[PDB]
Amino acid sequence: NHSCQKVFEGFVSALYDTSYFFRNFGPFKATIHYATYANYLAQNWAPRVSYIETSTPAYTLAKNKYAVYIVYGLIGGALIHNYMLDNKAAQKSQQYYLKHRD
Amino acid sequence: PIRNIQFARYHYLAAVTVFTYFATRCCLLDYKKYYPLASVKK
Amino acid sequence: MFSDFNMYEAKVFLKAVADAQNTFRQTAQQENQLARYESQSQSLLNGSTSGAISITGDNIQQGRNFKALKEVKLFQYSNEIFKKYLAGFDSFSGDYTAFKKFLNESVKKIEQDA
Amino acid sequence: IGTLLYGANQSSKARENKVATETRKERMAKPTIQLTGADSQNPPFTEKNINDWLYKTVSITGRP
Amino acid sequence: KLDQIISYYITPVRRFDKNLTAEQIYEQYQQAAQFNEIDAFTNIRFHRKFKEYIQTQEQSDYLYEKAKQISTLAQKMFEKKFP
Amino acid sequence: SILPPLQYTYSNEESLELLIHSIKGNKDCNSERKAFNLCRSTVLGKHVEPEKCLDKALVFVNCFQKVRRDESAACQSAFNSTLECGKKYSSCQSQLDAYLNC
Amino acid sequence: VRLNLKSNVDQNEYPFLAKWDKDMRQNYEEYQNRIDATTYHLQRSQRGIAVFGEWMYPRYFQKDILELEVLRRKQQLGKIYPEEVSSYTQINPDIANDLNLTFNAKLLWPVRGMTVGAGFFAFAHLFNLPYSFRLGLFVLPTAVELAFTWGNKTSQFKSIEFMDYLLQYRVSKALLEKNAKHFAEKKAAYQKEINSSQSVQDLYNQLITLVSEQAPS
Amino acid sequence: MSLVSLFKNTFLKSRVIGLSFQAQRVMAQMAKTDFENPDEHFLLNDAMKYNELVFYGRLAENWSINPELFGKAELAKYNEAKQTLIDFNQYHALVQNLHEFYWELKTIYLELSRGVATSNFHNKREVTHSIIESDIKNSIHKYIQLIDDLKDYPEWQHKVREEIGYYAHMIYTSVNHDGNFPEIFKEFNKVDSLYYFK
Amino acid sequence: SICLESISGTIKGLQKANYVVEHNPNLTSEEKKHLKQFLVYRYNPADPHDQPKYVSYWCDIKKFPPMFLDAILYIKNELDPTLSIRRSCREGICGSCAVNCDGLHTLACISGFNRDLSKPTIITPLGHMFILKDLVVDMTNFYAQYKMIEPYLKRKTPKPDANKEYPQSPEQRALLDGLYECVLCAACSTSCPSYWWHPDRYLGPAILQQAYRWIVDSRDEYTQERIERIAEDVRLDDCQQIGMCSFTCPKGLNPQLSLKNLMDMVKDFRQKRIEQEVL
Amino acid sequence: MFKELIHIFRTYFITFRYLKKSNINFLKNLSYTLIAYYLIINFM
Amino acid sequence: ARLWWTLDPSKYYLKQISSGGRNEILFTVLGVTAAYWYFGNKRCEHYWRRQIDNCQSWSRAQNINGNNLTVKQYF
């Protein structure tokens, strides 16, 4: 370009140096490392239900052949129990405020 | 030998449908445009 | 359930009923607010005139003739009437029904002695 | 570290105590409220209204 | 769902008796907001006591109407005592 | 926590009775109610001078109270039948239409 | 509901009340039409089946309950004047900003985004970047400001609070002009013998508590 | 009593040795992968103890163990595992530096490519500017020096010439033989130019 | 500095040159037209004063054989010798003369230009490849991609005969028949859209077909390694099964089918690496 | 969806090739987290 | 290719922990317990609310400076 190319180089070098300092400054480097591994664990080892069962059926745990139905039962029971608790709370509130209405 | 392949398919389809339902609001329209072309009661 | 047309008939009619009750409330409150402001202004001007309260900017101070304030007389009479009739007031630990009964008894006594 | 935290907590409690005692002085700088007759027999102090009567001087009649 | 919606619309409506006329209803609303000069000192005690017996608008309205009746009687007596 | 709180607690019987009486009033007291809403629409009548709307409000409330009384024996019988149907409901349109014709 | 535009106020004895009534009746048609459209939308949405309505109602139709509430409140207050806005700056500053963000008073040109993009244009003109990058880095901050400006529904709640406050203020100010004639005689004596700008409603409560604490009783 | 120390030591030794067994496979796979995104096939096909290997290698090189709990064979195996993890860390640093240099060359190539595309109505320049030529010259010099430094490792030298030098060849194909072209590519037109049929 | 002027020039450039989208200078001034019109692309990036310069030649069809290469040679021998073009085999076997023969990437020599004198015929370089000179693109990026696939026989194990031939049989010979006939003319690659957008990370139809030929070679025992090499990033995945790589092959090969089978093997290869590696 | 969307971005847009697959896989993680958060909160 | 839409999960995430299946029962128990705590308080707030108007619910409005809010008729 022109004489401003020196300013361009200075600015880009300053940005590079700041990035380098921030990345591998001991505490920041350690916390970025731990954050990267935590992100890997979260994304790749999420609580799935479908997975490759390479082991023979004589080796697969019964905890794995029934985990789907355990999860479905727990979620459905939680939902129906929440609905029942909402109905019970509604009737309880109505009865209580009818008793205290007088 | 994927376990619960049907469940995985159903879960992915349900997630996609729910996301498209909430992100686009396709099933929850606004009928203010249709209000002028309507006959009122009372 | 009923038809949605009937449900909306009910909706608009209940809106009108609530608005009518709010109209009653607004009229009563407005006329009594006029009366209340007139009474409060008259009380303040009378108190300042008879040298019972000294008003300096924001805070009022007790004067020499403070014992002759109509507000002081009202306070004494309120305390006396509460003592004589509302005996159990400010300490009634009973339930709401018992509180209503006590208030009704006090009202009947005051009506007898009105 | 524990002793430093305890010292900070006690300093905060001292500030709260100063605020409380100044509020109590403001409450007590008022003239005494007389309770004679039925006003004695049915004192206005109750657990529901205690915060509205704390550190207020009363002259109440009754039998110890 | 329309049942729940009309319940929400029902709630703001006060339950006045069937046999009351509109004029009597308006009178009962007048007495609730009735100015007595004695109220300024009785209202403090009334509010302090009723602050714990109020959970429902029905209780609020009944207690405040009773307090206003007491205040009106006290004001009548006071004005008959201090002409 | 977002739905509006209730002011007056209505029992099921009271709510159904108010529903049916409001429907009857809107089919009967429509003119007075419309006049009252006409008075209560302007700034004056709604906020500044509600004193003007006093007579129209009284007329409307008197008409509604007359509806709530339903002194007619046929009206009482049909209303009781509709209330019974509604309480069994914890449909009813034919009963309502039979009642409203009275 | 089909309120005629001409007001019946005197306009020579209650100028404020007449102006308020004129503004209320002038804009009544537009706000009434928008209210009708919103109510029809809500009714038809309630009329839906399962996940199309009557299940997601009114829990998920919260952007039009707010619109209906704002429309009704603004219908009551026909026009908001800048003099009355500044008073609410005592309670909440930037209330004019909230009203602009919610009420289509003017065109909210992205001044901040445009000047930030111009700042990028200055740097892109020093260590020369292509004009494609210049256009992109001009659009980006303007787009950011537009995203952070429009859709702000908390401004709608702030405007609801302001409209409730202004409605109450106008109702009270309307009563002031009606009873100004009646209180003229008492006002002179009250002002001349009580030198205090405190309100009578505020002074009297001081008297009430003063008699409550220190009185011969 | 020393439950915390026991658990820390057993966790560290377990992870370190387990990832020491599955370390040469990961290094070999990273060798197969191109220098552009050497961590690919782990983000896409199989993350076969790659991220776990990096994390626990850094931990092992930056943690300490209590030799009281270890046996003699256990401590020898753990120390060999720690050495393998440190070598993996050095290998990862090497491949990351090579990948970053590859991306430097690819950035030069993409800057050239954006100036020739038909969609580029934004800026059409017949002649490359001075600073891009200087960057090309400097990067080619660095690439030649890198190849010279890998003279003791013929396989690594061949991989670098195949992968990193390919974009140098692409830059060669994108520029006419005019102006300072002979001087800019003077280091390139000695050996690696003939590797790409030039 | 050099930015704003460049932007103004280029925006003014194409807009003022999109109207004149074919320059068409004439070699000479002619009046009577009994001759076919040849719009031959001309560009010599050796002198600063030169731009893509379609030249309209007029010449009798009869005087040269009905081949595009013969027509170009007639143009570049008698009328304008400055024209350049690669050609050696004259039989459609070397692949040197691959050019855009009237909107199609086919070998110039084994090709027939249209006989209608009214409609001009346009000859252009191979297309999405840098232009060294008139109709002479540089296929060096193509050639280099041929080096990556390791196109030589690779044996894991030796044979016990040590004095005889690798047993291949006639049936297994036919597997690589229809794959080895490619002349590396690079006419499918320059007409393959996936190669248009990613000349770097996409090997191309011809190169992937050569890789498939070496993979299905019966003697070759590095099938898995070759699959791994080609089943990396978008080396092969970028192919979109468009089918234009087969429509324009002068030798009648089927690069589309070759790449389809290669992708099928890759898709099986990913699955096979789990089923056949579990212990 | 994300795979082919990224492929479309990479094929046609030259400047999208500046992003190495390390950054793209980071966009993948962020997008998946955002989608999970969106689905969770829309039911709350 | 030209056929990429499948509901089948990607094999990249289909891996499995060495000590059994992916941790789902534990995480679903944690989620259910979190749901009970979360949809146990909004239920408490929803059904135990009443609206009261008393003239005692109102308190003097104040500015950001703390002094009482009084707006003049003519500002």
Ligand code: SF4
């Ligand atoms: S496959 Fe056919 S068109 Fe393609 S390079 Fe080979 S001979 Fe030419």
Ligand code: F3S
């Ligand atoms: S057009 Fe190219 S994309 Fe595939 S089938 Fe043909 S090789």
Ligand code: FES
């Ligand atoms: S000259 Fe040999 S292919 Fe044409």
